[PDB]
């Protein structure tokens with residue numbers, strides 16, 4: 001299953017092409033400002049087979065809880081209502097969000113002790129790197 005190395009508190013130390021990603025998502029202007037400024041902590045935890053990903057920033061949180069492979073309802077930080085699934089592929093924790101006939105993916109993998117999140121929307125690709133705190 002999910003490597004226990006995902007578990008813990010993660011801090012954003014690098015982000016590339018995130019504005020373009022948000023723009024691809026049709027994110028509102030206020031949300032883009034927030035997104036480009038925020039340097040969130042991501043907390044990954046588990047209770048039995050329920051995995052939780054909590055994202056905390058200065059004055060805004062998001063949280064999802066899920067079982068691998070089981071679709072669930074999600075309200076994203078930019079307020080999309082998506083049907084989402086998190087799966088495990090070759091150690092990569094892969095999230096897909098679907099809404100309005102659209103699709104975006106967030107793939108998280110551990111690389112040299114860091115967590116690398118790759119976001120893709122219509123060929124726009126984001127990379128956000130987290131270090132263990």
Ligand SMILES: CCCCCCCCCCCCCCCC(=O)O
Nearest residue numbers: 035040057060061062077078117128
């Ligand atoms: C809740 C703190 C973050 C605020 C960012 C708001 C801008 C909209 C973000 C929507 C998609 C974000 C995906 C981030 C992936 C990650 O690096 O965990």
